[PDB]
Design a protein around this nucleic acid. Structure first.
Ligand SMILES: Nc1ncnc2c1ncn2[C@@H]1O[C@H](COP(=O)(O)OP(=O)(O)O)[C@@H](O)[C@H]1O
Ligand code: BEF
Length: 855
DNA sequence: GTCCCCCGCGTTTTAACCGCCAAGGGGATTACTCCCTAGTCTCCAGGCACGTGTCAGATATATACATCGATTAACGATGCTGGGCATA
DNA sequence: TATGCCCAGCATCGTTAATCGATGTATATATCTGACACGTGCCTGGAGACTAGGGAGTAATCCCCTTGGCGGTTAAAACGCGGGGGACA
């Protein structure tokens, strides 16, 4: 709640030497300081004497110290070169790129109208910013959000209008509907077009979904397995009416990719994922349900694997029906916490999208069999029968679509091995370790390709004297993979290719980080240490067509974790990571469909070592490649309110039923009840006129009979008789009754408001649609000025009359709960419940505006 | 910085120590026999692992009843305000 | 023509009644997990039964060791006095 210093944004000078001290930073430089408990849009250039003693001051002292050292490294040092200027100056634009992303929103979480100190109540939005966790979500008023990013406000209103709550979802658990194998594509792909095997896979998932069974999508990496999942979920929600919540577990590295693809292909569905640790959990819990002792405002989310094990009570207390997972190789063993954790969620159908090798161990395939079908089910001689029965037994429940059907638009594939010999350092480090001197088992396998893995190893090679070229010279010649890697790297640099290096050891990545940095090679690492905010900037920087990073380092599990590289084509592997097909899936992050200049792969096989035996063992595990017509009282009243709000409901009834008011009935019954209500209304008005005119005639006869006795002189003039036909006739002219009729128990139903409501709403639909159909925010009236206000505590002009009809045109009459919360009108502090703007007091004003426009 | 409880030291008072002799309880040795143990067999039922089963608590869950919160349609009485009718 | 007089006209205030929805409270039912008792099956580590032998019981004798009593010197414990130096605040 305190207004202290959070972080530092930018820095410059305030008043327009060898080393500026802190005093020069006080009386000579101003710094852009970001305050805590506040958005990044309130950054002010402050120093020390302008704010005084405030909470938090050491951060700016350390930042100013790094700025002093930076100034000592820009032009106040005789040892600086040329690349150091581009690096130190590159950090400036780097921090600017990491700070400008906090000013643009990305999502509006909630929208609660809070009161101020002057008594007014303004609607503030829970703004979510870009490249930031769910924390630090500040409330911003609706007076400047619509003036900066209207797409987030319009989409935020679209999430509330498109009511896809689970209470509207169908319940085909007792009987599945008739399924039809489609061939075309549904009009929901707004991103791009699809081929044939995508729609075939969708027809397979929906083909098996109608039978109450689950399958495994085992296609090739790159055939659009993510798009088929989003299209299958969207088609299942909007087709089979399955708007219920669907949990899709996605790793944290691929979560932003699935968010961008999900919003790019299906923008009509929200994608509120689950990230953070503590406060973000409170954000997801406060956004999950309402503060009451069951308001489902979500459906599709993304949960990381660790977030499942960390939070089992929050996710386990919610019902689910569909489960999707990318890279489902984590379920290799049936004795893990994730395997028993996913089986605890009461779901209905599952779907496994992965390509794990189900041939090296039977517990993997069997684990994937009993994972979705609990109950279903060695020697080399009986293996032909075991796979002869299990093969065709599992074929109807698996998709095996090879890449041979998509090679018509893909470049050729090739791979060349390279048996690299050892050197003298690898000989002494390969023989002298298992003797006497040390200076257990896996350390030899790790040191079978690079000696620099301990401590007493760099000073042993350096037999002379700080130098720089001698260290790198003694570093490249220590192993053959460095000399051959530098020669092949130079050969690829003579033409122009994007080369990748996949390594298992995390220390070798740092060794390459110290070797490639001296040679002037711009690159960026990617392992399991940096957070998503950094690796996402690195990958988004590598995907640029003008990127100068021709080398991009990865890892094994982190390298083949997810996402993809489109501009990469060359994949260099130091050694096999002790896993079959791990190299195929590792090259799958670069060798993809978007690549056009082919793919060249070099495997640095260590000759006469220990990795060739592991490679042979990996080849051994690779050769195996085998009531509807019933309308109750609440339906008559709710339908009557639907007529009072929307009028004619024979054209947008599908939108007036899915809102949650009208139950699931037949449209013909709504049409018949509507025709009977309107017909009985018109007939009741006609009878009301035929009888009312007769009553008026009787009051004219009795009134004349009273006047005949009044003009004679039989009535005293001292007291005027109030009980005469004249008074009851005058009160009959100003009668306080309406055309009422009881329809099927429901009493107090007016017929004039229905006809006049259809006329007013019809004149509004034809008036707005007959002039501005695709731009309702540009409708005008001209010179038609109605009567002024009657003592109102707010300014009201013609613009309020023009924008006031927009809310009635969109939401309808009587829906003042959405008009006061609409930021596209400007009447935020002009609609209340003591006060002048009332509910019916303004509605009758709208009726006066419509009656004024009709005349 | 103060006060009084220990050490050092001379003399007064008790009992430890050494020498001698006595007497008998109790420990040390021995011989014989007889109960109690290790050793050896057979047997299982005691015990170990595990599937199967209804009952403590705990968690909702469809259904019904009672009590408001708040909203909207309806009714009693106008207040200037607008649109026309008899007089300066 | 301007100024008081007749006839509507919506919004001002207040009050009644029907309705959707939230809150509180039962009430019999369908899961959830955690079992402790039983029967399933099997091992044999105990029980059961018998033998054989040598330890330990006891009894009968021995003689060493422990307790006792006594009296003479001769050091030791006991006492006090006095004042210094360590405890304690
Ligand atoms: N239907 C499609 N049409 C065109 N391109 C597609 C389609 N589906 C996927 N892609 C391409 O595939 C890339 C995404 O890869 P993706 O299939 O999501 O990886 P994964 O193997 O994790 O599913 C995108 O860059 C996109 O260009
Ligand atoms: F093969 Be995908 F990129 F997971």
């Amino acid at each position: 709640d305190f207004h202290g210093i959070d972080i530092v944004i930018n820095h410059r000078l305030k008043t327009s030497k060898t080393v500026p001290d802190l005093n020069n930073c006080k009386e000579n430089y101003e710094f852009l300081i970001k305050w805590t408990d506040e958005s990044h849009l309130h950054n002010t250039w402050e120093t020390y004497e302008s704010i005084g003693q405030v909470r938090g001051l050491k951060r700016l002292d350390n930042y100013c110290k790094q700025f002093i050292i930076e100034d000592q490294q820009v032009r106040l040092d005789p040892y600086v070169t040329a690349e150091d200027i581009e690096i130190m100056d590159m950090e400036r634009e780097r921090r600017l790129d990491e700070f400008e992303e906090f000013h643009v929103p990305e999502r509006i979480i909630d929208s609660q109208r809070a009161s101020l100190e002057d008594g007014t109540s303004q609607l503030q939005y829970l703004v979510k910013w870009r490249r930031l966790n769910y924390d630090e979500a500040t409330w911003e008023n609706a007076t400047d959000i619509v003036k900066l990013a209207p797409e987030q406000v319009k989409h935020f209103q679209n999430r509330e209008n498109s009511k896809i709550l689970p209470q509207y979802s169908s319940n085909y658990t007792s009987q599945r509907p008739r399924f039809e194998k489609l061939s075309v594509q549904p009009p929901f792909i707004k991103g791009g077009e699809l081929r044939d095997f995508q729609l075939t896979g969708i027809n397979w998932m929906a083909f098996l979904w109608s039978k109450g069974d689950n399958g495994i999508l085992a296609d090739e990496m790159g055939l659009g397995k993510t798009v088929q999942t989003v299209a299958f979920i969207s088609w299942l929600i909007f087709a089979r009416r399955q708007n219920g919540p669907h949990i899709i577990v996605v790793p944290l590295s691929t979560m932003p990719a699935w968010l961008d693809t999900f919003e790019k292909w299906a923008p009509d569905l929200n994608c509120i994922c689950y990230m953070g640790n503590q406060k973000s959990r409170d954000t997801i819990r406060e956004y999950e349900f309402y503060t009451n002792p069951k308001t489902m405002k979500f459906n599709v989310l993304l949960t990381t694997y660790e977030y499942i094990l960390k939070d089992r009570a929050e996710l386990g207390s919610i019902k689910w029906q569909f489960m999707a997972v990318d890279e489902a190789h984590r379920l290799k063993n049936a004795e893990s916490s994730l395997y028993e954790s996913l089986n605890s969620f009461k779901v209905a159908n599952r779907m496994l999208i992965t390509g794990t090798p189900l041939q090296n161990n039977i517990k993997e395939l069997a684990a994937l069999v009993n994972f979705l079908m609990p109950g279903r089910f060695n020697q080399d001689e009986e293996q032909e029968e075991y796979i002869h029965d299990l093969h065709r037994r599992i074929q109807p429940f698996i998709l095996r679509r090879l890449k041979k059907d998509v090679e018509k638009s893909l470049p050729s594939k090739t791979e060349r091995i390279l048996r690299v010999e050892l050197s003298d350092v690898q000989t002494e480090y390969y023989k002298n370790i298992l003797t006497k001197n040390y200076s257990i088992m896996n350390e030899l396998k790790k040191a079978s390709n690079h000696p620099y893995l301990f401590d007493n190893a760099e000073e042993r090679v350096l037999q002379k004297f700080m130098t720089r070229e001698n260290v790198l010279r003694g570093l490249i010649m220590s192993s053959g993979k460095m000399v051959l890697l530098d020669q092949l790297l130079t050969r690829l640099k003579k033409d122009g290719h994007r080369v990748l290096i996949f390594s298992q050891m995390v220390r070798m990545l740092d060794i390459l980080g110290d070797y490639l940095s001296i040679k002037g090679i711009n690159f960026q690492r990617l392992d399991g240490t940096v957070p998503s905010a950094q690796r996402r900037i690195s990958i988004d920087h590598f995907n640029s067509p003008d990127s100068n990073d021709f080398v991009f380092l990865l890892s094994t599990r982190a390298g083949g974790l997810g996402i993809n590289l489109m501009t990469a084509d060359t994949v260099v592997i130091f050694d096999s990571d002790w896993n079959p097909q791990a190299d195929l899936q590792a090259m799958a992050r670069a060798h993809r469909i978007g690549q056009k200049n082919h793919v060249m792969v070099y495997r640095l096989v260590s000759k006469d070592t220990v990795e060739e035996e592991v490679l042979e063992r990996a080849r051994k595990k690779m050769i195996l490649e085998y009531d509807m017509d019933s309308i109750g009282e609440s339906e008559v009243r709710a339908l009557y309110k639907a007529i009072l709000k929307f009028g004619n409901l024979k054209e947008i009834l599908d939108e007036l039923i899915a809102d949650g008011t009208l139950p699931v009935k037949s449209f013909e019954k709504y049409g018949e009840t509507y025709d009977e209500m309107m017909e009985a209304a018109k007939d009741c008005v006609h009878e009301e006129e035929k009888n009312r005119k007769e009553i008026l005639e009787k009051l004219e006869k009795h009134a004349t009979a009273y006047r005949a006795k009044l003009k004679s002189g039989e009535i005293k003039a001292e007291n005027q008789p109030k009980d005469n036909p004249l008074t009851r006739l005058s009160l009959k002219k100003r009668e306080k009754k309406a055309v009422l009729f009881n329809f099927k128990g429901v009493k107090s139903l007016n017929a004039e408001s229905l006809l006049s409501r259809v006329e007013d709403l019809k004149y509004l639909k034809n008036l707005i649609n007959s002039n501005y159909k695709d731009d309702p925010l540009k409708f005008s009236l001209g010179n038609n000025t109605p009567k002024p206000v009657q003592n109102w505590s707010s300014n009201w002009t013609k613009e309020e009359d023009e924008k006031l009809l927009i809310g009635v045109f969109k939401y309808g009459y009587g829906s003042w709960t959405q008009i006061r919360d609409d930021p596209f009108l400007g009447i935020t502090d002009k609609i209340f419940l003591k006060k002048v703007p009332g509910a019916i007091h303004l509605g009758r004003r709208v009726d006066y505006l419509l009656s004024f426009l009709r005349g």
